Amino acid sequence: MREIVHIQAGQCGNQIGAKFWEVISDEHGIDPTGSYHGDSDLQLERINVYYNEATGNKYVPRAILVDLEPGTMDSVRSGPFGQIFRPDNFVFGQSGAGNNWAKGHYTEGAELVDSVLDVVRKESESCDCLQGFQLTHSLGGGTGSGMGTLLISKIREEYPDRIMNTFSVMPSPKVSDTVVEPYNATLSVHQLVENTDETYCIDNEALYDICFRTLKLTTPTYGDLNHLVSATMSGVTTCLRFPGQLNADLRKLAVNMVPFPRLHFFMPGFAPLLTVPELTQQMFDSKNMMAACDPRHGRYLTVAAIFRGRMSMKEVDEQMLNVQNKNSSYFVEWIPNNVKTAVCDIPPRGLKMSATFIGNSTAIQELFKRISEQFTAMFRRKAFLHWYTGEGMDEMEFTEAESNMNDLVSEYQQYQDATAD
Amino acid sequence: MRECISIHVGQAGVQIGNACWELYCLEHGIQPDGQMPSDKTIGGGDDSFNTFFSETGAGKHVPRAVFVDLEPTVIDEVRTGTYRQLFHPEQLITGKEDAANNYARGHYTIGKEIIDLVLDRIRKLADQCTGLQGFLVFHSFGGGTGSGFTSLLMERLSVDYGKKSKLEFSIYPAPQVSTAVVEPYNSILTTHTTLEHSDCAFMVDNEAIYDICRRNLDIERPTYTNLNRLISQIVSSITASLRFDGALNVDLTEFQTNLVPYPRIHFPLATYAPVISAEKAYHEQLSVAEITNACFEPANQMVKCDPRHGKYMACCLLYRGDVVPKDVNAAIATIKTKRSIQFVDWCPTGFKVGINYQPPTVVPGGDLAKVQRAVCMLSNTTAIAEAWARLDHKFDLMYAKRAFVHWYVGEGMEEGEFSEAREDMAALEKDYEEVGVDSV
Amino acid sequence: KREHEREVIQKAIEENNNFIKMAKEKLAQKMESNKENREAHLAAMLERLQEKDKHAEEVRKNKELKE
Ligand SMILES: Nc1nc2c(ncn2[C@@H]2O[C@H](COP(=O)(O)OP(=O)(O)OP(=O)(O)O)[C@@H](O)[C@H]2O)c(=O)[nH]1
Ligand SMILES: Nc1nc2c(ncn2[C@@H]2O[C@H](COP(=O)(O)OP(=O)(O)OP(=O)(O)O)[C@@H](O)[C@H]2O)c(=O)[nH]1
Ligand SMILES: [Ca+2]
Ligand SMILES: [Mg+2]
Ligand SMILES: [Mg+2]
Secondary structure, eight states: OOEEEEEEEHHHHHHHHHHHHHHHHHHTTBOSSSBBOOOOGGGTTTGGGTEEEETTTEEEEOEEEEESSSHHHHHHHTSTTTTTSOGGGEEEOSSOOTTOHHIIIIIHHHHHHHHHHHHHHHHHHTOSSEEEEEEEEESSSSIIIIIHHHHHHHHHHHOTTSEEEEEEEEOOTTTOOOTTHHHHHHHHHHHHHHHOSEEEEEEHHHHHHIIIIISOOSSOOHHHHHHHHHHHHHHHHHHHHSSOSTTOSHHHHHHHHOSSTTOOEEEEEEEOOOOHHHHHHHHTSGGGBSSSOOGGGSOEEEEEEEEEESOOHHHHHHHHHHHHHHTGGGBOTTSTTOEEEEEESOOOTTOSEEEEEEEEEGGGHHHHHHHHHHHHHHHTTTTTTHHHHTTTOOHHHHHHHHHHHHHHHHHHHHHHHOOOO | OOOEEEEEEHHHHHHHHHHHHHHHHHHHTOOTTSBOTTOOSTTOOOOGGGGTEEEOTTSBEEESEEEEESSSHHHHHHHHSTTTTTSOGGGEEEOSSOOTTOHHIIIIITGGGTHHHHHHHHHHHHTTOSSOOEEEEEEESSSHIIIIIHHHHHHHHHHHHTTOEEEEEEEEOOTTTOOOTTHHHHHHHHHHHHTTTOSEEEEEEHHHHHHHHHHHSOOSSOOHHHHHHHHHHHHHHHHHHHHOOOTTOOOHHHHHHHHOSSTTOOOOEEEEEOOOBHHHHTTOOOOHHHHHHHTTOGGGBSSOOOGGGSOEEEEEEEEEESOOHHHHHHHHHHHHTTSOOOBOTTSOOOOEEEEEOSOOOOOTTOSBOOOSEEEEEEEEEGGGHHHHHHHHHHHHHHHTTTTTTHHHHTTTOOHHHHHHHHHHHHHHHHHHHHHHSOOO | OHHHHHHHHHHHHHHHHHHHHHHHHHHHHHHHHHHHHHHHHHHHHHHHHHHHHHHHHHHHHHHHSOO
16 A cells, blocks of 8 residues: 545645546545445455545545634635545644735744644554645645745755655646736745746646637636636546556656656646547647647657557557657657556546546746746836735845746747757 | 575565466466375475475465565455465465565665575575475566565575575566556666676566567557566476476486587577467467477567577577477478578587477467467577667666656666666677677 | 586585675675665754754844834
């Protein structure tokens, strides 16, 4: 049993977290009471990865729920599957961070962090063999952003040989107007680059554009955006949750996907938003990326593709070979055999077949460049800086975060321009 | 006496172990509970099958075998499966955390936690032997445990058992069934580390086996189960000389004398025939000449390489089933005046032949036809070095950028172990070139 | 001839012992160098995180000394 400890921090964190648990509980055939009423032995075989067992055949998410705002905690508890989370695993303050990273990271968040650790430690010590941690949060706010990144640093000190995995929601002016969001995102990125092993970039920009442009929904709710997030998240954790060969645990996934420790930011893809050739064509389409970057504007270092549903393995193999053949310029030639394929038998809910894509592409720079441009339009005017210096932060800290994020960009550019010869 | 101990390491080693041992049981009429009705000597004996099976007072025939994996889920399948009564619980050893496709973890971080326990279990098998001949080690090149733990284990066996022979069955990686980008790293590190500790190593190229399954057995998309059944047939042919006796039987050790001209030149090419479906075998008997001919078809090799473009240093034919020397010699004489068989000038050209009379068995539900006669050719060719050239090239592409190297350094390894392992491989490729040059 | 035969068998024992000796020692140096490197890689990571707590102490300090 290789246990994962799940942490959700802040509004976004908690919203997407609850959605995550709904989808996977359905897929593993467990009740909102916490009972197994499924049909397939394959649903229970690796249940331990995400669920603790309490007797009465009751499964309890290994989930920790965190916010400085007491509100969203009621929202989870009154949600569907609100009954399932351990009462003790809820950790609320009352002073909401008011979209201020410093409040989350240095002050109010730092006052609350120690009783979050208490619950982490309690969950961790009960583990047969802990893989590590996944945090769902946004980078735009203050709690998810600041306190989420503080939790990372703090967990890392006590579990330095464990994997730290994040699902990080990147901000977009198309979804939120809160102007200080570029600041919050840059300070977050600075932390994530040094202290996580793997980060799934969930770009709000891209989620908007899929709802508006592909799904044709004129103004999309957070609920429409999150339907995409949960279907993605179900996809990328399939290999952890069901018996299988490839990328079956967080460390093995990291070793296949991370050629250089800083370049650990992944674009996930989904399809459909069907025949095997179409699924394959669609998952590699710019229009199917959960990050707002064109793959055809960089090169792939590594890729994982997960097919779900009853289909021909022969055909998936040929189609994967076909896509690499035809698109060979977009895979670095100095990492051989860098695209891996898993096929799981269980489709997600409502689909006969799906494809989930995880890419480490140098085209992710485009996302960091967007954040850097919006950050630089504030910072050279010292705009809203008093919100941060007001909690004790130096101007030097802003300069450092920015130029580290700039360093990450040129590094992605370096490996894009590199050749075998 | 002459006992052999089998050590199955990691997922590939273990799953191949299952297939081999199931097949050995069918070959000797041993039931899944270990009982063998035809064995009249209860609790012991010095029969041919005793090289591979020990015997308890209650009539149980027990594999002289240890299964080891750093993770528990593949070994748990042996523990709860068909042949679970065959093995004493202490022969099946598991940790909790695997090597995560990392040689450093298999060799150091994780493997050092379990190595003393494994050597104690091996010691317990060795102590039951009256004349231990040596070890057969089964592992993948690509896995973290298969590479790192095996290399640690081989080093330690050299210490504890001196020069006692150690043979390897090594699974060489293929893109169609591989699970890690870093398999070329793991392959070079293990090959460099075990090279001095191993007497003889049979490389099994997963792509050669995948191709044979697709092409000869009409399997659309072969699984490990397909590959392993075929691998076990080949392993069985090699060990058949140890497990049966007969007039024209020739011991594996005697083939080895011919197969290893210098200690580093110890990687024989295996080729097996016939591989044929039940549908195609029906009413079509393959004669001795047909199967011997199939040995010189490169599509039938266990490693992809072309012997027509290198030189032979030895050639051995291990026949099983309904085969007499007259027919073998006729088939050999035909092939010699018709095939691309060039020897180095320093070794004689005669083929060495052994025949076991016991015909091949197949496992229920498998893909291979039951045939009356089979052959495994073991050759020593300079062409095997192509398999090294391919892996070394993959290693160089990634290593020039230090791609993934931080995963190994993070576990305590230095870059100097990489360049050192790579240099040994360059020197090996060079050795293979030099042995093929004519004498002055 | 008998003295020569004695020397050959002694040579064989000596070389087999030298091989066991040298394999035992190379392995022990490798397991030591590795334990040290792993440890220094972890000590460095922990130190970097130690400097983060020291910077967070100092930032909260810098807040309170302003009214
Ligand atoms: N995709 C998605 N994005 C969200 C959701 N909720 C909030 N966001 C985004 O999250 C960012 C704001 O962060 P929040 O999670 O609301 O902030 P917080 O972490 O709760 O911090 P405080 O409210 O300041 O205590 C903005 O960019 C929003 O667009 C959601 O349910 N789905
Ligand atoms: N022929 C064959 N090859 C296999 C099998 N299982 C794995 N492999 C190959 O072995 C390599 C992967 O190594 P494994 O043996 O699975 O890894 P391991 O030794 O368990 O190492 P870790 O899991 O990293 O601790 C790949 O090249 C696989 O294709 C099998 O049953 N048969
Ligand atoms: Ca007996
Ligand atoms: Mg909020
Ligand atoms: Mg394994």
